[PDB]
Amino acid sequence: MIRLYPEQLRAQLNEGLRAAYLLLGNDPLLLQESQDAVRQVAAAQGFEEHHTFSIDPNTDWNAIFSLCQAMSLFASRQTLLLLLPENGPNAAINEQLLTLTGLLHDDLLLIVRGNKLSKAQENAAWFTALANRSVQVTCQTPEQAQLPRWVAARAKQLNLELDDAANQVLCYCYEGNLLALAQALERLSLLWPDGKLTLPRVEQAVNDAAHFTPFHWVDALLMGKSKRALHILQQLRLEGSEPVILLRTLQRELLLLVNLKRQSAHTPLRALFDKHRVWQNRRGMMGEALNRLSQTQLRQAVQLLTRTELTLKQDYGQSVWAELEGLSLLLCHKPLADVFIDG
Amino acid sequence: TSRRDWQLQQLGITQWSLRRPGALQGEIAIAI
Amino acid sequence: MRWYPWLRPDFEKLVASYQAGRGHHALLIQALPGMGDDALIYALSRYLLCQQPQGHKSCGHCRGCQLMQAGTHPDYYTLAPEKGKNTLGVDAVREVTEKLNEHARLGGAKVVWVTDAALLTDAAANALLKTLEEPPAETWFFLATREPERLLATLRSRCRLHYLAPPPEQYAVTWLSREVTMSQDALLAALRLSAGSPGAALALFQGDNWQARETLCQALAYSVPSGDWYSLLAALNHEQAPARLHWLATLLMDALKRHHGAAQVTNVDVPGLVAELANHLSPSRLQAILGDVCHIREQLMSVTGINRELLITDLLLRIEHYLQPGVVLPVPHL
Amino acid sequence: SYQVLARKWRPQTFADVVGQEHVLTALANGLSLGRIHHAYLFSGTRGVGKTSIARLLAKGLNCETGITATPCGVCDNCREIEQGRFVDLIEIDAASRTKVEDTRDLLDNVQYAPARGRFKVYLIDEVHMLSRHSFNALLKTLEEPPEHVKFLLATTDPQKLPVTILSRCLQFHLKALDVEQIRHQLEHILNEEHIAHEPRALQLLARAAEGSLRDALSLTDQAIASGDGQVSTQAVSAMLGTLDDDQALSLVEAMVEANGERVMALINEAAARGIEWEALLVEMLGLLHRIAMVQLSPAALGNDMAAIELRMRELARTIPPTDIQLYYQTLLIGRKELPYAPDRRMGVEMTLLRALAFHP
Amino acid sequence: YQVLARKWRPQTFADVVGQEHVLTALANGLSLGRIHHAYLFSGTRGVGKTSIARLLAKGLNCETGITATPCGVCDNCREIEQGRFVDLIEIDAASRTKVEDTRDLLDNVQYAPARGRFKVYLIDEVHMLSRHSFNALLKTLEEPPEHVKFLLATTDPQKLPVTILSRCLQFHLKALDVEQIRHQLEHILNEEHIAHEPRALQLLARAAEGSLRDALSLTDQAIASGDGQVSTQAVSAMLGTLDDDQALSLVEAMVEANGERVMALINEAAARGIEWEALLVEMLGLLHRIAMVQLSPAALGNDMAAIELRMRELARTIPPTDIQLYYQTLLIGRKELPYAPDRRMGVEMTLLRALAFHPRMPLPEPE
Amino acid sequence: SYQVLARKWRPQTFADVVGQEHVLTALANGLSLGRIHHAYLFSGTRGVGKTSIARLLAKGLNCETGITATPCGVCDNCREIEQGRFVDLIEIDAASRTKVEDTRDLLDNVQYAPARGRFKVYLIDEVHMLSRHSFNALLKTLEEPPEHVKFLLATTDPQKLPVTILSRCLQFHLKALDVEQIRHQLEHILNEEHIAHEPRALQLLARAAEGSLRDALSLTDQAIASGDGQVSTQAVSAMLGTLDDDQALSLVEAMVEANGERVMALINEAAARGIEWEALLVEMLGLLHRIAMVQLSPAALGNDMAAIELRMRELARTIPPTDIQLYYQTLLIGRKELPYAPDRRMGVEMTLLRALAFHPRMPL
Numbered sequence A: 001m002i003r004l005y006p007e008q009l010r011a012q013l014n015e016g017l018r019a020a021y022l023l024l025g026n027d028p029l030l031l032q033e034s035q036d037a038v039r040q041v042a043a044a045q046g047f048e049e050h051h052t053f054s055i056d057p058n059t060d061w062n063a064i065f066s067l068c069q070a071m072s073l074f075a076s077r078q079t080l081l082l083l084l085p086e087n088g089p090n091a092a093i094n095e096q097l098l099t100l101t102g103l104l105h106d107d108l109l110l111i112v113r114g115n116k117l118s119k120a121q122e123n124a125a126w127f128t129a130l131a132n133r134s135v136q137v138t139c140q141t142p143e144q145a146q147l148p149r150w151v152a153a154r155a156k157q158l159n160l161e162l163d164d165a166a167n168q169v170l171c172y173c174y175e176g177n178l179l180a181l182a183q184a185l186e187r188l189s190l191l192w193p194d195g196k197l198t199l200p201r202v203e204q205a206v207n208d209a210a211h212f213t214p215f216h217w218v219d220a221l222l223m224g225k226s227k228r229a230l231h232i233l234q235q236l237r238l239e240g241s242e243p244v245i246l247l248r249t250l251q252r253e254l255l256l257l258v259n260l261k262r263q264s265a266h267t268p269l270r271a272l273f274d275k276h277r278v279w280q281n282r283r284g285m286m287g288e289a290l291n292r293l294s295q296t297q298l299r300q301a302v303q304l305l306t307r308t309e310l311t312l313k314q315d316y317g318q319s320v321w322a323e324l325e326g327l328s329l330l331l332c333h334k335p336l337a338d339v340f341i342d343g
Numbered sequence B: 001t002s003r004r005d006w007q008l009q010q011l012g013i014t015q016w017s018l019r020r021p022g023a024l025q026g027e028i029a030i031a032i
Numbered sequence C: 001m002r003w004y005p006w007l008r009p010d011f012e013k014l015v016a017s018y019q020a021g022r023g024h025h026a027l028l029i030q031a032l033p034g035m036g037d038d039a040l041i042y043a044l045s046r047y048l049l050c051q052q053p054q055g056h057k058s059c060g061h062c063r064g065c066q067l068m069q070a071g072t073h074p075d076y077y078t079l080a081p082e083k084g085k086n087t088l089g090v091d092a093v094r095e096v097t098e099k100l101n102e103h104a105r106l107g108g109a110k111v112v113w114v115t116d117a118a119l120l121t122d123a124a125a126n127a128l129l130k131t132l133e134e135p136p137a138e139t140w141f142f143l144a145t146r147e148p149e150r151l152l153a154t155l156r157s158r159c160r161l162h163y164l165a166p167p168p169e170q171y172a173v174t175w176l177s178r179e180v181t182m183s184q185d186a187l188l189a190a191l192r193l194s195a196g197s198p199g200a201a202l203a204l205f206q207g208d209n210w211q212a213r214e215t216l217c218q219a220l221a222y223s224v225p226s227g228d229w230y231s232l233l234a235a236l237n238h239e240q241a242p243a244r245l246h247w248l249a250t251l252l253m254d255a256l257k258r259h260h261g262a263a264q265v266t267n268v269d270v271p272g273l274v275a276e277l278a279n280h281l282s283p284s285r286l287q288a289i290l291g292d293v294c295h296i297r298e299q300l301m302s303v304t305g306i307n308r309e310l311l312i313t314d315l316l317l318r319i320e321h322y323l324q325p326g327v328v329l330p331v332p333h334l
Numbered sequence D: 001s002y003q004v005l006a007r008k009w010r011p012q013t014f015a016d017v018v019g020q021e022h023v024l025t026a027l028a029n030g031l032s033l034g035r036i037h038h039a040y041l042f043s044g045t046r047g048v049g050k051t052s053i054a055r056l057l058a059k060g061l062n063c064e065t066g067i068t069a070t071p072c073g074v075c076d077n078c079r080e081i082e083q084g085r086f087v088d089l090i091e092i093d094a095a096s097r098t099k100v101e102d103t104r105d106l107l108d109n110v111q112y113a114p115a116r117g118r119f120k121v122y123l124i125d126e127v128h129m130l131s132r133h134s135f136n137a138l139l140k141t142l143e144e145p146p147e148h149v150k151f152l153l154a155t156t157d158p159q160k161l162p163v164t165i166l167s168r169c170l171q172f173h174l175k176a177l178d179v180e181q182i183r184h185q186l187e188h189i190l191n192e193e194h195i196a197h198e199p200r201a202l203q204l205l206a207r208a209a210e211g212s213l214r215d216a217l218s219l220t221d222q223a224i225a226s227g228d229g230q231v232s233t234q235a236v237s238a239m240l241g242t243l244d245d246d247q248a249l250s251l252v253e254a255m256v257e258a259n260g261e262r263v264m265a266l267i268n269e270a271a272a273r274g275i276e277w278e279a280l281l282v283e284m285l286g287l288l289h290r291i292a293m294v295q296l297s298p299a300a301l302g303n304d305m306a307a308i309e310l311r312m313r314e315l316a317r318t319i320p321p322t323d324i325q326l327y328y329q330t331l332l333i334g335r336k337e338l339p340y341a342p343d344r345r346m347g348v349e350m351t352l353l354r355a356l357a358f359h360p
Numbered sequence E: 001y002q003v004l005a006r007k008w009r010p011q012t013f014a015d016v017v018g019q020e021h022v023l024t025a026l027a028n029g030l031s032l033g034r035i036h037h038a039y040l041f042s043g044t045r046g047v048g049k050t051s052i053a054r055l056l057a058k059g060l061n062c063e064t065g066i067t068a069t070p071c072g073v074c075d076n077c078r079e080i081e082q083g084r085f086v087d088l089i090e091i092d093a094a095s096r097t098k099v100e101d102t103r104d105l106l107d108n109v110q111y112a113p114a115r116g117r118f119k120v121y122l123i124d125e126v127h128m129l130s131r132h133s134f135n136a137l138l139k140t141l142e143e144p145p146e147h148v149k150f151l152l153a154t155t156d157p158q159k160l161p162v163t164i165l166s167r168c169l170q171f172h173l174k175a176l177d178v179e180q181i182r183h184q185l186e187h188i189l190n191e192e193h194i195a196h197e198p199r200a201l202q203l204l205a206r207a208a209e210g211s212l213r214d215a216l217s218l219t220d221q222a223i224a225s226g227d228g229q230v231s232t233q234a235v236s237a238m239l240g241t242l243d244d245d246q247a248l249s250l251v252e253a254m255v256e257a258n259g260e261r262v263m264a265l266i267n268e269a270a271a272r273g274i275e276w277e278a279l280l281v282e283m284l285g286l287l288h289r290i291a292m293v294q295l296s297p298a299a300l301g302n303d304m305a306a307i308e309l310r311m312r313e314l315a316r317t318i319p320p321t322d323i324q325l326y327y328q329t330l331l332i333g334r335k336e337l338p339y340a341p342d343r344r345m346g347v348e349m350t351l352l353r354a355l356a357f358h359p360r361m362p363l364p365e366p367e
Numbered sequence F: 001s002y003q004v005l006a007r008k009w010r011p012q013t014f015a016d017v018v019g020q021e022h023v024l025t026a027l028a029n030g031l032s033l034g035r036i037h038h039a040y041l042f043s044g045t046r047g048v049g050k051t052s053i054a055r056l057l058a059k060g061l062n063c064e065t066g067i068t069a070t071p072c073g074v075c076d077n078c079r080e081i082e083q084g085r086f087v088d089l090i091e092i093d094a095a096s097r098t099k100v101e102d103t104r105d106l107l108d109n110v111q112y113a114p115a116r117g118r119f120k121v122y123l124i125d126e127v128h129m130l131s132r133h134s135f136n137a138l139l140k141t142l143e144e145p146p147e148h149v150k151f152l153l154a155t156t157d158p159q160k161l162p163v164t165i166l167s168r169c170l171q172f173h174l175k176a177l178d179v180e181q182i183r184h185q186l187e188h189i190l191n192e193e194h195i196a197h198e199p200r201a202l203q204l205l206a207r208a209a210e211g212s213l214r215d216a217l218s219l220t221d222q223a224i225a226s227g228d229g230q231v232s233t234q235a236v237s238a239m240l241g242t243l244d245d246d247q248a249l250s251l252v253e254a255m256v257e258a259n260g261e262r263v264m265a266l267i268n269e270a271a272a273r274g275i276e277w278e279a280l281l282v283e284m285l286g287l288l289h290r291i292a293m294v295q296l297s298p299a300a301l302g303n304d305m306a307a308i309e310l311r312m313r314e315l316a317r318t319i320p321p322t323d324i325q326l327y328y329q330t331l332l333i334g335r336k337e338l339p340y341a342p343d344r345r346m347g348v349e350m351t352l353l354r355a356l357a358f359h360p361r362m363p364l
């Protein structure tokens, strides 16, 4: 079984076409690109017939088996596509896939899409049956460290010029959402035929800043930017961002900060960041908080966060925005009365 | 502190004392 | 479904009533987990469904006994949660009630067993009231629960309550020593931690729970002198957090009792830890920490979807803050 | 085959019921004067005869002789209603018929005239379980029922019902039976059944009833079954606690004296003998209340407790009332949080440890 | 026989109690001829939103003409009274909350009225409509046909979108006072030839809050309990309201720190089976009223005049701190009441606690 | 009649569109260069012009002159599209048609070539309400779309759509219309409508719009209806006051200055209308918290509270922090004690009195 990345899929297809192709990952954009490339290559080879089905407990495998067995008078060279469940195949799905792999023909080109398979899922009869005649392409969203490389490559293949500041702004605004970033790049190219994308142009484009980025608010809190954090929180409130998502992100960051603060009384902050595999870009802002808030802070903040989380888990109150603003000022160097923290 | 005050504190009952008695408009007659 | 030696007496009473016909149509058994109430209910069901009873035991050869052994008795019904679910729905109760209306296939008594009444939903409990109040002739109901207070009052009032008790402490200790090889102090501590119920201590010993308890004790022993209670997070952040919180609360209670002066302590296998806890902590701080631990454990066991790590971290930070002088301690209130 | 006392002793006449004098008088006056409403609702706690009163009213309305407050009990309609197979009396179990479709189907058939009786009675039970759509569908027809239909509603949680439904029916609230009433009813039932009994057993059963007569009858049946067919003080005390009367006194005395050793030893003995902790807490609360009462006036002490008078008076004279109030508050807090504690014994020990701290 | 709440539904603007501003505005609009195409009514339950909407529909669709004083005798008025008027489309938004029903209703708005000069849609409980239903009504509501009028009634106006609120004229009805309810009950009973007493009617009005539907339901229940008469004893039994004199005497005894009188009152109350929770609620209400009187002389209402002077004496004797302490103690007692072994026991223990911490005369300290 | 402003003033040209430059310019450049994609999606808040821009794009695509960003507006195709009678433009309301059977018939029409247009345009609105089978059918159609068809999508909940559907279309997000642009649009609309207006009324309407042009037009229509065919400052001020009901802020201001009579009057006014006392206490607590946050840092107050910005700023500048903290603690205690009070009104009155004239005694 060959293993590849999206960039090498085109080269592999140029070298030859294999019987089965597996697309496992959690990145819809890369999976769609790989599927489109494979289908285009198959159509060039003479595959003008395509079929797609969704795998679920209420699945009509009889139709698939009939299609595999049935021939075609003129429209030969069939292509079949399967969409696995998000959870993954079960024993019934395992045996169904084994039976389908048993009924394979040279004129049938099989494609499978789904999430990454675990060791138990990997160790399956159907999976091993295709080991000698299959290629799997891994398609997952890169981390922020590898994000700017991908952004630069995508801009380059579109015949566009991006400045370093513009690349950083694009990565910050569309972290974890490659589809939105690609759409933004396309819109920028449409706006400017010359293709020169300077920092002011993207900054004007960033004026949109639609929603879904509470990490910006959390980073503003970590940087001690009271004005920026308050503004971003207000924009999120206007956008109706799920307060639970903000609470969970700030909870992760605050737990990490509390652990670092407690264990840094005998260790340097940078060593602890290395221990926790923290990203250097984050390490900065985190450090600022760890160098801006005493141990008394990050404890009243923890109390407020825990009370708000319990209230939202039991009461589901919509006043969570005011509590979030209070916690925002608490995370800054503002003394705060400590009475608004219910203490 | 006073024993009664400590007992009330243990009971969770808070004691309120006048701060701006001029706000009240009426014959409160607090003093005797 | 082991038949424990201590189940003989109670059974000999209950079946006797069924021999005289003075048996209540709704029996609710109160017993701790591992007491074998399921075995008693199964024995009663076998006795009731036997076509040719002899003495206080089923013949084991009639058609009813054969069907029960095969497990395909038409007149036997069991209400339990689904494999993937944790609660019993109302559809099962409604269909069972509808099926109970018609006559028995074998022309005998009909037995319905509820695995756990505590898991019944409000709708199911309300629906079952009419069926349980005036059941059809030759129909018997068996229910089991740990805390009768948690059941619905209307449902509870329609049942005859029978309560089982644990065996004597010495007998339980001897049985545990026969079953597993451990020090007497460890066996006694495990038995006391299980409210004196045999089997639960066996469950603790057979699994890795004892190693987790030892690790927690070591972590607490390290933390108490230094005062860094945050390190306990790793020892408490686990899927079995309620058990570890209960163990910590028991240790705190034992330390407080030792400070006040007592002859019996739940944790007899670790005198040093409780002695250090009593020496290094004042009674008020011990009581406050114990109350906080109990409240957090109750919140974890009650709230659905609550985050374990955040609550544990908040509890540890709160305890550390309370350890500081000049901090107002919480006071229980309505 | 065999029927429990609750089913066997369901009242069949207005004179066979216990208490609820106001409801009976109002119904009798309404029937006599001819002022009959088209919507009756009954509210109250559990086991207070709401269903029984509704069935009696249904029997009275459709009796062959006429609309009277004293049904004959011998005509065909009376017997059929008593046996629960009367055609024109439709009983609905709202707990299992919450679907709006069922309500719509039921309402679609109201236009048809009654088969035998002069009225078509609908008795909806546990109506609080119906959905909002069911209530909305009912509203219109309940506001204008035909002249040949009647609606009877029985509920235990009237708060859930919307105000619109409540305003469309005459509401009758049933008062929880007193301990004396429950004791008298149990004594009468046992005398009619020719079963030996003792006053103390009846008192204990009535006290454990907690205002529910169905619970009292169930406990009486359990005691009869477990006491070789006889009701005795020893059998009831075995089925119940009551052995904590002296133990609770010693426990509260030890708590007041602030002696941890004695309190823990007593708790260990109690756990070994296997008593109920809730009963122990209730007894301690009662003893503290009695001690507080005696302090205000010596004569307040009950005569039935003429066995520990010296100790009770010593405690009253030695302990200030403020400490008594503090201990009562602590015991109430412990009782509230008892089910939420990991174990009953653990919660009781926590409460007692907290109480012990209140001593200089 | 017939329910009073229904038999006495207003049929003319003169029969409406209160709501002077809304009636005056509607009459002025009808007289001047300036008629809007969308009206919204807001207020608490049982104030007459539906009745006012029906009266407006009668006035608009009356045979005589567009007038603020409907005749009440023509065929249109009688049919509207009986609810059989074709041109008056009454919609129960609570049951029909789906967008398809709204679209079906909107698809038949351009058709002319069958017999009347206007087609009036009266939507009730409009707040229960779905978001799609609200959005679908914007265009038609803002441009109804010349022969189409929309009337909206709700109890929770703030739930409606601002866009919906911007396409109608809002009228907010107000809860009726005790005087108006008592006068209406007196008039109804006089018309019904039923004996009554002033105290019974005052109690019924006070227990009905500001809803006439509840007041009439309570009156019917009292008549049923009173056996054709409305007596103060019958109303007190129906409401389970202990005599205010007893509560005031208990409060005075508690203030005086004489527990013998308090226990005597407790025994007397237990003799008649007085509800203990109701007693605690009454004591809390009396304490709060005394505090308000201390805050302002005019806080006290007229219904308490019979005891007013007595209460005033307390206002001139009890410091505010003592009043606050007693109120807090009774509030805590109510908090702990459910968990007490008995309600009688709980109330007795609460009173003993209050006496023990009496600011002026605490119970004697043991030697 | 006079029609509705929103209906009569649908943007019929790209110039008439207010704001949204980043989208209009990109669309114009794409049309000019011929870079046209198969699937387009529009996202944003209510009343931002997604449907209007989609209709303008559809009109531009199938204009007789050619594919241009500036439709002539005079050819038969433009007139039919404006009237909505264009044969090759199929408008689908996904909310009304959600079942797979309804969508399948519409999707099967792609086989037929365009009758009187270069492209067969499908404009699906509220597409987020489609069923799973409908989404599957749409994905099947979009996998291999004919070269002569285009799909336009508009919704306010893009997250509801499957990732597969999103990945195969170009998405444009629309922003708010600010305040000055809304004011200018309203001024132009009223000038064309021959309706008298005043600058202050327009400014108030724009402020109340809160970035939505449809809301602004609805408020303008309300003012016209209440103003008797005329827009005036007094009419708009009264209209807004009817929707203000600022009893909570007035109560807070009265309490901070220790004015019992005003507090009682405001309590009576609030009790006149149906209000939740606990909600009032929560609102007062939130206002006090916001005041404290503003005192800590001026940036705490945002544009969400622009209506009462001046009052909040004055309260923050004037009142010392200690009084705010004391009042907040008193209100917290009042909220805690409210459930067991004899009545909600009585509890609120007692708590307000305590805040006005009483000070709690903290332990130690």
Ligand SMILES: Nc1ncnc2c1ncn2[C@@H]1O[C@H](COP(=O)(O)OP(=O)(O)OP(O)(O)=S)[C@@H](O)[C@H]1O
Pocket (backbone or CB within 6 Å): C154, D005, D006, D007, D009, D010, D011, D016, D017, D018, D019, D020, D045, D046, D047, D048, D049, D050, D051, D052, D053, D155, D156, D213, D214, D217
């Ligand atoms: N007022 C009463 N008079 C006589 N027996 C009563 C009375 N109330 C209850 N009982 C007894 O308790 C049994 C149950 O009474 P019910 O009629 O069910 O009261 P209930 O209020 O309807 O209970 P619910 O609401 O259905 S749980 C009766 O069959 C009687 O044996």
Ligand SMILES: Nc1ncnc2c1ncn2[C@@H]1O[C@H](COP(=O)(O)OP(=O)(O)OP(O)(O)=S)[C@@H](O)[C@H]1O
Pocket (backbone or CB within 6 Å): E004, E005, E006, E008, E009, E010, E015, E016, E017, E018, E019, E044, E045, E046, E047, E048, E049, E050, E051, E153, E155, E212, E213
């Ligand atoms: N102002 C009033 N004058 C006379 N009778 C009134 C008045 N307000 C209410 N009523 C009576 O109370 C009844 C209430 O009728 P409704 O139609 O429910 O009025 P409503 O205000 O719409 O109630 P809601 O809001 O729907 S619960 C009327 O039929 C009258 O009998």
Ligand SMILES: Nc1ncnc2c1ncn2[C@@H]1O[C@H](COP(=O)(O)OP(=O)(O)OP(O)(O)=S)[C@@H](O)[C@H]1O
Pocket (backbone or CB within 6 Å): F005, F006, F007, F009, F010, F011, F016, F017, F018, F019, F020, F045, F046, F047, F048, F049, F050, F051, F052, F053, F154, F155, F156, F213, F214, F217
């Ligand atoms: N950008 C805009 N320029 C001018 N007028 C606009 C603009 N956006 C909205 N409007 C006005 O608001 C009315 C409705 O606009 P729509 O395009 O239907 O709103 P919308 O963005 O489609 O909201 P949805 O998608 O239906 S929830 C139009 O008829 C215009 O009067």
Ligand SMILES: [Mg+2]
Pocket (backbone or CB within 6 Å): D050, D051, D052, D154
């Ligand atoms: Mg019943």
Ligand SMILES: [Mg+2]
Pocket (backbone or CB within 6 Å): E049, E050, E051, E124, E153
């Ligand atoms: Mg109404």
Ligand SMILES: [Mg+2]
Pocket (backbone or CB within 6 Å): F050, F051, F052, F125, F154
């Ligand atoms: Mg739109």
Ligand SMILES: [Zn+2]
Pocket (backbone or CB within 6 Å): C050, C051, C052, C053, C058, C059, C060, C061, C062, C063, C064, C065
């Ligand atoms: Zn057998």
Ligand SMILES: [Zn+2]
Pocket (backbone or CB within 6 Å): D063, D064, D065, D071, D072, D073, D074, D075, D076, D077, D078
């Ligand atoms: Zn008869």
Ligand SMILES: [Zn+2]
Pocket (backbone or CB within 6 Å): E062, E063, E064, E070, E071, E072, E073, E074, E075, E076, E077
């Ligand atoms: Zn007329």
Ligand SMILES: [Zn+2]
Pocket (backbone or CB within 6 Å): F063, F064, F065, F071, F072, F073, F074, F075, F076, F077, F078
């Ligand atoms: Zn054109």
